[PDB]
Design a protein around this ligand. Structure first.
Ligand code: THP
Ligand code: CA
Length: 137
């Protein structure tokens, strides 16, 4: 029952937050189930691998032919008005790619928006951990 819908990139902001045109409306999207390191907020500062995660997401969405968003089963926006979705760049989930590279942690799992939680934890993050990649080094 989850389905992918088209969207158009407006601009990548950091590793886990991107602005997209979705159904004619400009919106900020925040990637479900992950957290890339901080690059903007003063209380946190530039966290290690924050710049790298931002560069990674920007490259991925900017070089994509097709961007798709897939909402989960619960809330579609968070308290800041950001769309909560799994985002796909030519069919590759950016959320998963970041976790697989050790550039993001599985975080903020709020049910019922947890459909891909087991794959992201058990496969992608577990593998990044085993390889000691980037945040896991
Ligand atoms: C990913 C995600 C984040 N959030 C909220 C939790 C955090 O709130 P707080 O600002 O109160 O800590 C914040 C983390 O996002 P950032 O990583 O963009 O800061 O966004 C949700 O409410 N739902 C989600 O699914
Ligand atoms: Ca973040």
């Amino acid at each position: 029952k989850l389905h992918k819908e088209p969207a158009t990139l407006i601009k990548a902001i950091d590793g886990d937050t991107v602005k997209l045109m979705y159904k004619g409306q400009p919106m900020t999207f925040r990637l479900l189930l992950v957290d890339t390191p901080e690059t903007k907020h003063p209380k946190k500062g530039v966290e290690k691998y924050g710049p790298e995660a931002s560069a990674f997401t920007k490259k991925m969405v900017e070089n994509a032919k097709k961007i798709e968003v897939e909402f989960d089963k619960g809330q579609r926006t968070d308290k800041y008005g950001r769309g909560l979705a799994y985002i796909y760049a030519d069919g590759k989930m950016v959320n998963e790619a970041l976790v697989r590279q050790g550039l993001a942690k599985v975080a903020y799992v709020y049910k019922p928006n947890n459909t891909h939680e087991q794959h992201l934890r058990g496969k992608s993050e577990a593998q990044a951990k085993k390889e000691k990649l980037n945040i896991w080094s």
